[model samples]
Target: GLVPRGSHMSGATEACLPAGQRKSGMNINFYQYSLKDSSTYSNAAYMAYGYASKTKLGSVGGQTDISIDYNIPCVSSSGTFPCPQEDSYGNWGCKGMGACSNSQGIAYWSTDLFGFYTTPTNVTLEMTGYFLPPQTGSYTFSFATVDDSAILSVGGSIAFECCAQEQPPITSTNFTINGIKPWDGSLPDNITGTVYMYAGYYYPLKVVYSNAVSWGTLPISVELPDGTTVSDNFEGYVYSFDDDLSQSNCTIPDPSIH
Candidate 1:
């Protein structure tokens, strides 16, 4: 399984901001990796942690075709949206194995694992961006997956992770990572980590998901300090430096001192 590393900086003091600011979404760079036959969970973990590098298999740029507001939700199993299709083996899911058969196994942007192809046995998805907190305080981010392994980091620290084995079995239950249970028993497929943030400052964020076999989706959400939970579309809360932050007066703290 994937090992959870790094700790969040809590109770950090920062100057507060005023209210009535408009929000935007995070800009993300999605990276796809094609692994070799001998690649194991350890290797995938290393790659996710930047300890190893492998040549990417290919790219299908601008395939999402639609505007997304900045929320990463679970792809529906049934609907007009891109749903998981049953593979030849009778397994029904998304990400690694459930691309449209006629479309050469390529998934669209709306799917949780965007731009993934069908029939791949070993693959990984890495998404990086800058997260802007809606309010200054502590926030908890959670990732939930099915039959897939995932890792998340915020502000240069590993937050939560799960299921990094060779061919993780198809199941809805959350896998424990490094002796820590990601879910609180209420949600069977969720893992969570927390960090303190500033209302108007942007922090680096990264999410990694790996699949060795069939079916999976990564649903990421966050719980604010006020007990408010936000997920499925972080339109007003996630953003990158490239976005027009002038309306919100957002700032990116200097990496050297932060």
Candidate 2:
């Protein structure tokens, strides 16, 4: 049955399934893409940026093999003109950069892209992999992000999108989701969101993130079933996205949510 939004939930029902109920998988692969020396936001810049990053992605499904750390920067708040690609990773913007390590099956930056004293900047981290839900039922997936912009997608399906210039730009879809209780924490009760999922099912996951040439928040959390988190630890192979953002080399089930 669909858990009615705002029906009131707590503890196990409120956050994540018990550790026994949760499952583990593979490492989530990371790829870098960027805007071509431009400061404006558009579909063309994003799609073109995808094509430009594939070559460096290292033959699909392999760990990244670059040196410079890439952090997407945010643009000026005043709509200031003339954003230049200074010390960029590749061609334009903060498309690619420094070192990234996949520890605990989670993709994270080991070094700062723009030196040691840098925070939010223009950058995009695209993730391709699988999400394994423990029990067969409606699972609330909540996203709390601090970014210039980002989108959470499952099985190629877009579940949430947020764009802001604030430090904590967070909002969920379809009301609040099951929240967290321990080990990790929970998303804000009011702004969380949920999605229905089946047990033992592997959902194809994709996240398209963007950073402007300015500064903002750094944490992006995807809370699954409540207390637990989802990433490379799930039971699926993370592959590299080709120029077309296609996962043909890997068996990517239709990530479309109906």
Candidate 3:
């Protein structure tokens, strides 16, 4: 009972459907860890550039969520400067900023960290699923910004890696399709990678993002061979499965065969 695409349905009605009825978006997992010794790092720069190893402390807690799009924007109302701390809702602010604000809530830290830490540091997020291309042609994947580090893989190949120069650079086993410069906290004009894809085919997509300090966000964009660009809004376009096709295969039988 999958919801029909382009159906005119109320939000409440759609929410009432069983989980199996709605099969869109990627499954996201978030792992939260606090620094073993926060006092060793005096400033944000130390935490961002030097204290990368300290970020990996005992796992405090984790949460499972879903996102309709690859874009993970700064949760703060304020601009990128003075990045807000992680809130109970697991929303992170801008990068390389001090800890501020508890307005999101006080549930996570109070219960998970035993109230010993006011702000959560060093978060790892993994998103996995499949991408259903809307057209049959070359598709380019790009990242506008990344906080600490991130790696994106499509069709079992590394398509993009943000901030590759960071200490202990993030890596993937799959070979990279193209090379792009590391993100410098600004949007780049270059396309990260391109791959030929067929419309209606499902390609495995995985994104691993980690933030060492206070805040971070990941904004991913896609450019179609037809010159159309997709950003932020990814709804019926992605799925959790590739229909009846095997995941090892990239191409599926034409719809006419059905």
Candidate 4:
């Protein structure tokens, strides 16, 4: 999934800090495309790449598949996360259909055939998957959901509403508490928060989703803008994180945090 690519340039240090922190992080969420490894790759059902010039990432992720409802068609878009059908080589479509002939159907990625950029008056994005925050902390953030819309399942229950369906993104106060400190801090947690966006026309969606459920000494990286890289993987890649990450026997106890 193309989420945010956060860095510690604004002194985030963790490289994945929230937006409010005033840090230099790349929010990968804007791409709204998905791509799995090429071995079992999917071309957003073929139309995503060459067929449809519009850049929606090909099939990515496993069971928790997320797809935006395109008013266009998606006949070429089918199969699971890592569909095997992609391995075959050569022309895929039948002779008469033509390479540029794409069916105008649901689940379509549009470039020229149809205009998909238009905002729906009352469209919904459904999130169907499993998730749990990695830690428990006072996580606060804001959003500007255009038109008559609101954010739900972030902090608490929903009814604490904001500008019901007004335009010019309204700033709301701290509302709702979705979960009560639940992360065990043993794994990477996933929080699936859905948005209820609406409007008269073209309600642009802009949001910053962030939360650091637990805190601990987990090896991360600080990739230099010029190309310096780091890693903690156990792949014989000579990296500082790799060397220090496995150093359970600390040279000094309780490393200074101040």
Compare the candidates by TM-score and give the number of the best one.
Answer: 1
Locate the minimum summed-lDDT window of 10 residues in model 1: 160-169
Model 4: how far residue 225 lies from native, Å: 25
> Which portions of model 3 miss their true places by more than 4 Å?
1-22, 32-121, 156-172, 175-191, 242-258
TM-score attained by model 2: 0.39
Clashing pairs in 1: 25-238, 25-239, 26-238, 26-239, 71-233
| Candidate 2 off by > 4 Å | 1-120, 156-193, 214-218, 222-258
Better of 1 and 3 by TM-score: 1
lDDT of 4 by residue, 79-123 (tens): 212112223223433223323234211132232111234212212
Native-to-model Cα distance after best TM-score fit, residue 188 in candidate 1, in Å: 12
Q: Each model's TM-score?
A: 0.51, 0.39, 0.48, 0.18
- Writing each residue's lDDT as its tens digit, candidate 3 over 117-152 gives 423344554455556677767788766655545556
Minimum summed lDDT over a 10-residue window in model 3 is located at: 10-19
Question: How accurate locally is residue 19 in candidate 2, as Cα lDDT from 0 to 100?
Answer: 17
Q: Which sequence of candidate numbers ranks them by lDDT, best first?
A: 3, 1, 2, 4
Q: What value of lDDT does candidate 1 attain over all alpha carbons?
A: 0.41
lDDT comparing candidate 2 with the true structure:
0.33
What's model 3's lDDT at 60?
18
Question: Scored by CA lDDT, what does every candidate get?
Answer: 0.41, 0.33, 0.42, 0.20
- Total colliding residue pairs, candidate 4: 18
